[PDB]
Design a protein around this ligand. Sequence first.
Ligand SMILES: CC(=O)N[C@@H]1[C@@H](O[C@@H]2OC(C(=O)O)=C[C@H](O)[C@H]2O)[C@@H](O)[C@@H](COS(=O)(=O)O)O[C@H]1O
Ligand SMILES: [Ca+2]
Length: 474
Amino acid sequence: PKETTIFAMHLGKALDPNLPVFVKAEKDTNIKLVNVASQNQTDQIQAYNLMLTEGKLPDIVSYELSADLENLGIEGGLIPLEDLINQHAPNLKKFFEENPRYKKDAVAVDGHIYMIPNYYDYFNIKVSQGYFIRQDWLEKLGLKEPRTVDELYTTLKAFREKDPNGNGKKDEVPFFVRANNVRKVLTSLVDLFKASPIWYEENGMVKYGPAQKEFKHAIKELSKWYKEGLIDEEIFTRGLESRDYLLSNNLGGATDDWIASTSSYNRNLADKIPGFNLKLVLPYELNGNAKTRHARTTYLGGWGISKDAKDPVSLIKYFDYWYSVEGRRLWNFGIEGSEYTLVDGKPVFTDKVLKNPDGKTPLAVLREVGAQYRLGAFQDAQYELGWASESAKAGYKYYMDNDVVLDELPILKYTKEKSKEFVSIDTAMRAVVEEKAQQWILGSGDIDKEWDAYIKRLENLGLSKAEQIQNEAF
Ligand SMILES: CC(=O)N[C@@H]1[C@@H](O[C@@H]2OC(C(=O)O)=C[C@H](O)[C@H]2O)[C@@H](O)[C@@H](COS(=O)(=O)O)O[C@H]1O
Ligand SMILES: [Ca+2]
């Protein structure tokens, strides 16, 4: 009756193996997954950390933080995969032969492969988030598109104060985000100010975003915008339904979010909110700086086979199934005759995905059947092109043609001892950044008074050492 245990979460949800996509993989592979993440869990980091203190690791370990996952491999919790691939995973073997660049994302410094990344279709679509504004609200209030951060401030104030949704209530939420943890909340707020909450490249050197003066300015500005009601008062708690809720109730004025799914709302709300026009704009300029650091990475997270799995050969065959023509189509597009049909050998989505009766993104519908569930699969840009609006496709080209996107820093790989030390310092600093950034934005601490002590705290945790490690690995 053999069960396969897994730890898998994504976007705050424990994987449900009864979703249509995984029922089909179960039928095709004979693998019956049982999640050791339970259905009430939503914090993937605390769940993972807790799972490690179990007795046994589950057979398959999926995690979004790939440096942590690779450290589990280095420590022996995840087994090397390269011989299992070479002998039992022909689709993966072919994928790695055909894509050496992607193969290097998977190979650790000691030469073993401890995880299959979940790859984006990066050499086809490299942009990710873009800035959007309610063009219909600008028009109703007689305003031009703001082009700098200060004009955006004035525009958001006017959205807040001048009832652009026309209902006689002071209900507007001028700028909002969509995220399921603090780092991703900060990701969609500090880039406005040319800052970053993570590591980034500056002229061949690697630097920590939160330790920079542009991060202090971003936070101090956000704190002032928060006090004046220009950014959602619930930025940190609203969760992943923020965008659906704020847009569909005609409260949200502007955001920074993934281009294809944010572009889906014009069609989706066309009847419910006449004239709704949430429109992509180039990143607002800050003293002539036109750049954004929103770019797709080559992969996100991954999964590996634990040292405690009884049957690693049947598990590597499961990993491989997702790389056949059919398994990769299943993962990306969902079920034939439900989410898509074949027209000339190629999938065309149905109205269930493209014209959801209740206002759902096409991507939201696809995720409800288990498509696009981050594990260790290979995204296919044709799935995204199959539901992306014409304004989404023009949007990608808009950001590329204007050269506003700075490439993401690769996630770097380190030797055994440095890798353990880097992830330890990086995680401890991340906690400090998220604690202080919240207090400063929410108004319970004063950034001007506390910034220097905050810097000393990061330094005392090891900022210099992590920085040295990042620059050796670069
Ligand atoms: C690999 C994965 O599931 N990535 C998640 C992102 O998914 C992308 O979303 C879109 C889109 O237009 O929304 C297009 C891509 O095809 C799809 O991979 C996305 O859901 C983000 C949202 O995170 S957040 O912005 O920080 O909330 O989450 C990634 O995990
Ligand atoms: Ca109003």
